[PDB]
Amino acid sequence: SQQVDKIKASYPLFLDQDYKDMLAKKRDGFEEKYPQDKIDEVFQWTTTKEYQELNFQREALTVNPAKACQPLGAVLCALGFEKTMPYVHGSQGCVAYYRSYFNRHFREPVSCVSDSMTEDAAVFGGQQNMKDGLQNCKATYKPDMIAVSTTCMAEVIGDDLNAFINNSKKEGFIPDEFPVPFAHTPSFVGSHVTGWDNMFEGIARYFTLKSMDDKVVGSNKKINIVPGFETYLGNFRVIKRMLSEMGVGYSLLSDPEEVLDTPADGQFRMYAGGTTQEEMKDAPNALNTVLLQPWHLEKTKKFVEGTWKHEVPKLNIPMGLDWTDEFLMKVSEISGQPIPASLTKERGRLVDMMTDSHTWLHGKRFALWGDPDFVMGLVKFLLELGCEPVHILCHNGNKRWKKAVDAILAASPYGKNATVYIGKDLWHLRSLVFTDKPDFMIGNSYGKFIQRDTLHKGKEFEVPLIRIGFPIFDRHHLHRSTTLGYEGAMQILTTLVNSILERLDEETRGMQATDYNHDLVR
Amino acid sequence: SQQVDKIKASYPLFLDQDYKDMLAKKRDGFEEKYPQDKIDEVFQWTTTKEYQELNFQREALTVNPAKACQPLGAVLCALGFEKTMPYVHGSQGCVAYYRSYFNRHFREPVSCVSDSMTEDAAVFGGQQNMKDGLQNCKATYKPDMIAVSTTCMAEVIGDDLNAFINNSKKEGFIPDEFPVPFAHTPSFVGSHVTGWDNMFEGIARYFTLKSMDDKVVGSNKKINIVPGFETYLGNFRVIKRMLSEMGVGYSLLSDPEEVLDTPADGQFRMYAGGTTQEEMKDAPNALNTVLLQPWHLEKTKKFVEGTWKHEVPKLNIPMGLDWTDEFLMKVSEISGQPIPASLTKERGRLVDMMTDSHTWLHGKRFALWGDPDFVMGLVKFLLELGCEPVHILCHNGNKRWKKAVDAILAASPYGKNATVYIGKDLWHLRSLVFTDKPDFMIGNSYGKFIQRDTLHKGKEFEVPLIRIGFPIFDRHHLHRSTTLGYEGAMQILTTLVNSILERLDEETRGMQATDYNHDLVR
Amino acid sequence: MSREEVESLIQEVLEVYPEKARKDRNKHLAVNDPAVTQSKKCIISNKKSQPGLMTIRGCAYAGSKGVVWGPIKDMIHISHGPVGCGQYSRAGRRNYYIGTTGVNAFVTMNFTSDFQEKDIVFGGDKKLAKLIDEVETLFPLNKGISVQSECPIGLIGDDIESVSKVKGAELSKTIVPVRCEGFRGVSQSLGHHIANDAVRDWVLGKRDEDTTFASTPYDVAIIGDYNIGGDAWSSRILLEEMGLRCVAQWSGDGSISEIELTPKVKLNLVHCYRSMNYISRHMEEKYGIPWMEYNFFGPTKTIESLRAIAAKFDESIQKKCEEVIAKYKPEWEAVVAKYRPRLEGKRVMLYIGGLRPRHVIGAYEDLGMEVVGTGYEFAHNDDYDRTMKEMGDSTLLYDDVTGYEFEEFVKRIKPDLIGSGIKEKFIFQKMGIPFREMHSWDYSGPYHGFDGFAIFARDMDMTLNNPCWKKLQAPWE
Amino acid sequence: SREEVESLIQEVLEVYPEKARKDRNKHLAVNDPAVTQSKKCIISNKKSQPGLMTIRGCAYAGSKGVVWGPIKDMIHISHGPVGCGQYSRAGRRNYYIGTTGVNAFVTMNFTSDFQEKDIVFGGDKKLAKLIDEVETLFPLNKGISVQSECPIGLIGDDIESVSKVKGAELSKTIVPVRCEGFRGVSQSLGHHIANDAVRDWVLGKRDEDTTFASTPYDVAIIGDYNIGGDAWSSRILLEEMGLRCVAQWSGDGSISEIELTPKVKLNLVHCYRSMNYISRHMEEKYGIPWMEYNFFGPTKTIESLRAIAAKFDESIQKKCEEVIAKYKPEWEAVVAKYRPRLEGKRVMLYIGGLRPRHVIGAYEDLGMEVVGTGYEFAHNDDYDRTMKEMGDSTLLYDDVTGYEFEEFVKRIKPDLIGSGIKEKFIFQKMGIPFREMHSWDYSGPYHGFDGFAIFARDMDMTLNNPCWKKLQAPWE
Numbered sequence A, B: 001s002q003q004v005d006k007i008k009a010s011y012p013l014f015l016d017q018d019y020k021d022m023l024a025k026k027r028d029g030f031e032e033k034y035p036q037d038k039i040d041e042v043f044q045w046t047t048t049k050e051y052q053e054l055n056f057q058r059e060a061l062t063v064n065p066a067k068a069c070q071p072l073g074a075v076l077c078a079l080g081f082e083k084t085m086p087y088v089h090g091s092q093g094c095v096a097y098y099r100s101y102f103n104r105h106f107r108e109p110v111s112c113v114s115d116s117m118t119e120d121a122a123v124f125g126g127q128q129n130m131k132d133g134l135q136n137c138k139a140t141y142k143p144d145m146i147a148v149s150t151t152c153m154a155e156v157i158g159d160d161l162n163a164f165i166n167n168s169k170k171e172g173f174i175p176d177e178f179p180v181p182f183a184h185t186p187s188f189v190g191s192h193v194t195g196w197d198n199m200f201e202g203i204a205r206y207f208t209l210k211s212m213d214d215k216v217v218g219s220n221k222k223i224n225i226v227p228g229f230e231t232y233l234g235n236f237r238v239i240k241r242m243l244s245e246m247g248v249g250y251s252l253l254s255d256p257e258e259v260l261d262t263p264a265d266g267q268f269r270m271y272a273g274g275t276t277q278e279e280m281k282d283a284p285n286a287l288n289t290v291l292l293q294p295w296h297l298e299k300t301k302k303f304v305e306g307t308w309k310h311e312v313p314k315l316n317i318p319m320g321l322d323w324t325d326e327f328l329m330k331v332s333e334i335s336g337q338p339i340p341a342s343l344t345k346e347r348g349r350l351v352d353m354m355t356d357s358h359t360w361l362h363g364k365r366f367a368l369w370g371d372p373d374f375v376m377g378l379v380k381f382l383l384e385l386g387c388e389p390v391h392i393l394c395h396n397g398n399k400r401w402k403k404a405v406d407a408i409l410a411a412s413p414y415g416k417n418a419t420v421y422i423g424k425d426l427w428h429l430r431s432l433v434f435t436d437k438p439d440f441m442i443g444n445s446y447g448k449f450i451q452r453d454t455l456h457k458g459k460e461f462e463v464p465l466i467r468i469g470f471p472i473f474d475r476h477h478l479h480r481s482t483t484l485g486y487e488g489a490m491q492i493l494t495t496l497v498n499s500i501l502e503r504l505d506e507e508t509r510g511m512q513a514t515d516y517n518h519d520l521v522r
Numbered sequence C: 001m002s003r004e005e006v007e008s009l010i011q012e013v014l015e016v017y018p019e020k021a022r023k024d025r026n027k028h029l030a031v032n033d034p035a036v037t038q039s040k041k042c043i044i045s046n047k048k049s050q051p052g053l054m055t056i057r058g059c060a061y062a063g064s065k066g067v068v069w070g071p072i073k074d075m076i077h078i079s080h081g082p083v084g085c086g087q088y089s090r091a092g093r094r095n096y097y098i099g100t101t102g103v104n105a106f107v108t109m110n111f112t113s114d115f116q117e118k119d120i121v122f123g124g125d126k127k128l129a130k131l132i133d134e135v136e137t138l139f140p141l142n143k144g145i146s147v148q149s150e151c152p153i154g155l156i157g158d159d160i161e162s163v164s165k166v167k168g169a170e171l172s173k174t175i176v177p178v179r180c181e182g183f184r185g186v187s188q189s190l191g192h193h194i195a196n197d198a199v200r201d202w203v204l205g206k207r208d209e210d211t212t213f214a215s216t217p218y219d220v221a222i223i224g225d226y227n228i229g230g231d232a233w234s235s236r237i238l239l240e241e242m243g244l245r246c247v248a249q250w251s252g253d254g255s256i257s258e259i260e261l262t263p264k265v266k267l268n269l270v271h272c273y274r275s276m277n278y279i280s281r282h283m284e285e286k287y288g289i290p291w292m293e294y295n296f297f298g299p300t301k302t303i304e305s306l307r308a309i310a311a312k313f314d315e316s317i318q319k320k321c322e323e324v325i326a327k328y329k330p331e332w333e334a335v336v337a338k339y340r341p342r343l344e345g346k347r348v349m350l351y352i353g354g355l356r357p358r359h360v361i362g363a364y365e366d367l368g369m370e371v372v373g374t375g376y377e378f379a380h381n382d383d384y385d386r387t388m389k390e391m392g393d394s395t396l397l398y399d400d401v402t403g404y405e406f407e408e409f410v411k412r413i414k415p416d417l418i419g420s421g422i423k424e425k426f427i428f429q430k431m432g433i434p435f436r437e438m439h440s441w442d443y444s445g446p447y448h449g450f451d452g453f454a455i456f457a458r459d460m461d462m463t464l465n466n467p468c469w470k471k472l473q474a475p476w477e
Numbered sequence D: 001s002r003e004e005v006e007s008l009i010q011e012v013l014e015v016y017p018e019k020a021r022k023d024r025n026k027h028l029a030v031n032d033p034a035v036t037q038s039k040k041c042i043i044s045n046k047k048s049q050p051g052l053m054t055i056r057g058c059a060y061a062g063s064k065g066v067v068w069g070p071i072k073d074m075i076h077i078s079h080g081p082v083g084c085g086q087y088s089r090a091g092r093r094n095y096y097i098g099t100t101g102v103n104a105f106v107t108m109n110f111t112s113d114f115q116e117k118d119i120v121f122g123g124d125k126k127l128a129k130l131i132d133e134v135e136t137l138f139p140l141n142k143g144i145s146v147q148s149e150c151p152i153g154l155i156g157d158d159i160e161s162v163s164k165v166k167g168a169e170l171s172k173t174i175v176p177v178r179c180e181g182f183r184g185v186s187q188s189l190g191h192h193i194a195n196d197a198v199r200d201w202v203l204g205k206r207d208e209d210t211t212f213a214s215t216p217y218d219v220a221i222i223g224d225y226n227i228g229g230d231a232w233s234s235r236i237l238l239e240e241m242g243l244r245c246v247a248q249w250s251g252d253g254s255i256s257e258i259e260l261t262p263k264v265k266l267n268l269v270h271c272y273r274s275m276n277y278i279s280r281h282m283e284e285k286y287g288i289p290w291m292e293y294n295f296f297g298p299t300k301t302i303e304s305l306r307a308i309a310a311k312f313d314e315s316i317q318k319k320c321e322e323v324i325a326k327y328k329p330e331w332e333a334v335v336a337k338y339r340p341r342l343e344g345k346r347v348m349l350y351i352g353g354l355r356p357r358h359v360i361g362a363y364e365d366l367g368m369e370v371v372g373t374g375y376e377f378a379h380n381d382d383y384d385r386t387m388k389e390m391g392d393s394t395l396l397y398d399d400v401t402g403y404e405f406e407e408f409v410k411r412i413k414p415d416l417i418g419s420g421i422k423e424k425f426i427f428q429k430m431g432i433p434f435r436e437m438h439s440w441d442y443s444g445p446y447h448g449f450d451g452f453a454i455f456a457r458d459m460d461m462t463l464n465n466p467c468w469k470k471l472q473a474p475w476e
Ligand code: ICS
Pocket: C063, C067, C093, C188, C226, C228, C272, C274, C275, C352, C353, C354, C355, C356, C357, C438, C439, C440
């Protein structure tokens, strides 16, 4: 039933007694459900050290992964170039998912095409798909460039992207001069971040490999910036803002901030902003190239050093205090610009906030996950705040990376109780937050189901989620946030201390029970 | 007892069984406490319409006010001028409170002096206190200006500030040319925002009244901006940012953003930034003067119009979409500068966020309080979001202001269930959120005790607090936020929709009971 | 507005295409007249997508795993292949259920074999057998496993059928191999068919020789309601108020035992014809169970459906039918009285999957709105046949519409409201056109039944009449 | 040290005008072991010099904020304009058990919100109407106090007559308190005024009522305002020792407890400054002895428990040693963990009237050294007690000015400063770890054995925090 002036959605509609009785009759009559006492017994078992040991012995099964597949990152990389259409050679179901995935995170349109290879092409290849796809794409959506990657069907059957594109030009389907960079992006290798590296290296090669002879390192006095797989608008903006403040000439290679944030002014803009073709062509003339997320830009680095002859600085992701300091100092050395008073002051305001909030942050225990560069930066900053990152999970991390994080932990007293996990998933993490309970989780939206599980054991066992990472689907507009630089550290600091204080207010809100500690001032 | 490896603070220490038993025996032995059933009965009664009617019949008693006294606003105003020491002629206990109040909200030092009048001065006045006070302050803290207000003791005994200051100069305690603007700031008149108005007008007249012969309206090609009582750093910064983006010359008169945010770099800076004496001296030569919070700048308005001969625009506080639009268009007309593409895009990005989030905002019911201009701007923006501001409380509001708000409500279907209250306090508001329960409260930290009260009736009756306003003491660094302009509208929108979604997640987190609606995507 | 207007519109839009694409897309675009009743005389459907035109379609894995099998709550469904497909489709579809997730129900979890390159080179059949054992150790209350094949499985020659047969016998467990590789077919549609056949071959006949179920004359099954936002619950409640016994729901909030019980019912009630007509035809041929199509969108269709269903039974059911209709009459009448004045005359364009592009028209008309254009991602001609009886004269029809086409149609027709999917929502909001998601219900709903209609009306009103839509143009522009 | 410290003092005082300099010189001294009469080296409890940014509050703070405000089942009216009650609403963590708004009212702000009409015509009629409204809306309150703000005495109001007339009409305890902020020189006189009001209007209520069943082990905790639970973590030890704590003045205190206090056998005074007045009175009138004690740190707490137990019989002295043995392993573990991390570090304190000396023992139990201390509003008898606690040649400052405190810190360079909210953010920006020693920085309790563990945790987390290494940009 409904009352017209107070209409109920599914919650709380289905709590009405007639729906409750209906659902009980459905269960008892036809679901043949395990009895509740057995459900309770198994749930408790899933929270034990015994279950955890079986859980970590898994070899073939993955449950609730914390990674996606390569083409997702090739699409995001391609979106960062001016009037560029991402184009995934293979089966169309993939592109629907890529677009919807980013749609839900950014709450924006996401343009991407497929060439719809089917059972036919699985045998004789997708050459005809490429010819008609490119011609169709260019005519219909008028990109200035089409950046081509592959779905796993195209990788398995072995389509030769280079040949197919050259034959499309040879046979007149697209102009010889029309730019069609490409990269192979097999989903069964690496993860989404690997696709970003592969796509970017492909675009860099397309515009510079055969034109190197007139290039001179440093002749344009700029510094190239490669951001990597990045899903916070604020992170593109803070980098451009800090370099502009320093007076540093720079080129941000793959810059999607505009196309991921177009205004609602009465017209749809399929393309907006982005790195220009001339910027890619001219990049070898830069003084150097800085990789903001080096642990998934290894292929790009080889090409930048091997072909452009740049000496890429050894720099961690600029997250937290020390690593932003190191970023700015290195940029200052390369460019000859001094760090200006404005950035020095911003640094000191971050430190001020640390002194103001250290008493509530000290000793707080965290479980966290994400991509490797983001995770290690979050770890570094947590140590700088006097927090303990006890469970560090990076599904798509590698041994060399885990060694580097383990060395960061060893250099601080706040790493004494921390462990780094690679190749583990969020069902592994669920066990850890039960057996070795932290105070909070820092992670993406998939963590909300872990918080749900911990609460079911008991309010005192609940581990609240703090949403930082990708994807965030169940809150609005956090993709506008910042995690890099002093600005990003300030945002993270605020989110953490206030998540702590929010939870303490909840636990002390009980009248005449716990509200003796419900302080007005904290 | 304590476990050394897991030390407990008051919460949860006193939940240990031995502390619980001790407290029960203290209660039963010596407190002569009312029976718990009697407490429950009275609590239930305080949530009823019958209680609300007695509550609203109060004439003499005020409970949990939502205002402070004038000198607090005079101190804040004075802090916005370069190397200026706020000076409150009167009793010293007031200054301790003013500093501590601002200390806790900004988490920053707050410099202010008293001249420590005692019982003896009630018979012979505070002249000698002023003479030694000004000399001691100038020598010890080396301000370039001392801005003098009064405590209520000085007002009652009737000290003539103008004469006392003139005699302090005549008798040689401070140099004749040393600037000592003053304002009488009686706490039994108006509220803290009145103190801001009085102080500012006092400073404006000190620097311009006797020098008007020299002035020509518009000759410096700038627009004066008077911000009023403002406790968000981002609100000073956003106004200056927008005007700079427009290429508009401006003078922000009273600008404390630097002294309330100095870096932690190893030295304490008693003063930083601020409006210069030259800017006040030259202010009559501006094109015009814009008042960002006109409903507590009436005296200032009469002086800028009566003496500077400026035609103050009829503008609302630039909060929300419509009123930021109106602000920028009027600044364009005065300055001759077009609204640039950057601000047009930012506007459309705010509108895009509105379209993205409107389905969770629509129909949400809010109780809210604060100062008059802030409250009416919050009302306006809420209506623009499709939200219903059902309980609008402004303790220090007046009839003319309430009429303007009632007219805004009457112009929108989302004002159909709203009531504006003036002269009522948070004990009045407590009753309203029980008898006509809203979904959320928007207010300062004193609202946490209302949320606690509502939870005690039942979780289904709880009204969560969303902290926007002044003072915020129980969260860290929200004073860095913005509420004006498109930037501030974006921040408020994000906070509101995400507070809604946080609460929905809490109510749907119960496994097998309500988590059918614990959606990953919202 | 006029036919000639629309026909010129179609020709204008197609001028941009290369020759081959132009000729193909023209066959999937039509303006219906009430005179032509055979969809096969005016529009082509269920053909391949043209390359590079940004179709809105998904794949057979989405239709099998995401649509039909995923919602079955007490089974564990393996996304067998690389890690992508299961991640993008984890909890994206709001097929609601009651359970204890991770112990006895598993719908919002993502199980996957996370293929690496070694699995491409040596095959994944050994990994799948090991994965099945790990599942049994760590999820002992699961009541059956399904294997949802992703693209590489069939391409590298794996034999998941052999694995499911061996492991299922070894473990005495229902293990369902499903060959829903994304390169099969042309859309989600073939995934439906493949999934229906997998139910038939591996699940549906388990109790063929069983006689322990206590049947009644009023046993029915809800076929093709995936309980989006609770849609099936707000339907089930009405059927049982009418005196029927709903033995099973395929597959929203569905259990495997419900599925196995369905051959014992008296009537199959088919909501989504597209996804479930295959298994419904099988059950009539094999078990003699008749099936009938119904429609619970809006009070007009819901009342019509209740009476048609009640007419399949005796006078007692027909009496309770009118008692239900009378009980709910004042409620939905109050909804129309409040919201129809606020929506009347407004024009709607729809683009959805395989059912709702026609099934929701009645509910829009119950609020005085007009559907001036509609289309499907993956419908067949029998769907379009049914669409011509619902749509008004001279309205625009589009099959497998391209992104360019949809934009250009909207620009010209200027509908007051668009109802489509997540890949479309943010395009048209930026154009200043109110948008409602008509797959996910924009995280609202249910929309089925009388209780769903209230929410439907509330939702169309809140978005169409929202104050944001008059703010897109800056006052100085 | 001594020579450098006296030179420091004179160098700092050169900034002042002549008159301020001559005065402030009298309020700054260097501890000299052979000088035990503080009246021979420092003066105190004098008016503050105008314009030098004293840290002191007023007599309303000492009465309403400190003594009366914590009494939990009474309603306290901030009688006057709106400011004073708002700034002091729930700023002090005097903790309590109650149902706020129903039977307890500590964190609420009741005020008469004086308008100019109340200045012109007087506030006595408004106060009588206020009392009636309080009675209607808060029926379970067990008494009302009227805390006078500056205007009340200046305009000639007569709150004593209102309290007498309304108290009799309604059969209610209504306490007029003349704690106007222009009285005295600081919070201190507010303490005295408040003590005298308890004496006059509350404490003689059960004078000849003898229905309470006394025992030989009845005591009262006098001068513990339960900051963060300080009084509860003291009470538990006293009752583990076999004593019966009849009353707590006034943290978590009820009016009935206060009224029962003339029936106890011994008054245990923690805060001498604020409650010695009423303690002396109860000794003069009822013959109840009083003693000073100290529950900061294991050494002082053990010493106090033994001294208190010596006032009773062997049964209590036996239970005393039982408590000392129970908690021995717990506080030894705290010392074993935190003393190595704090030993040798030097501390400067500036607080109100007790803690600037009372916490020295706890610091020394962690191997730290208090190199400077001072009080906002202490008297010379406090400074007498301080010289016994402080080390040779340490710096003592009375009513320190903001400028003095900053300049002393810049020269002495302590590792830690313990002071108030108006001081905290100054010294953090100078790179000096700071702990609030009024509010406990929203931590605590710090009293007793359980409080020592938190105190040590807190000093360690701040002193050794990683943020303090980061003040300086690597490029400067
Ligand atoms: S199954 Fe089909 S696309 Fe019939 S694949 Fe699709 S939950 Fe659509 S129009 Mo998403 S044939 Fe259901 C559908 Fe309709 S997922 Fe849902 S809304 S009624």
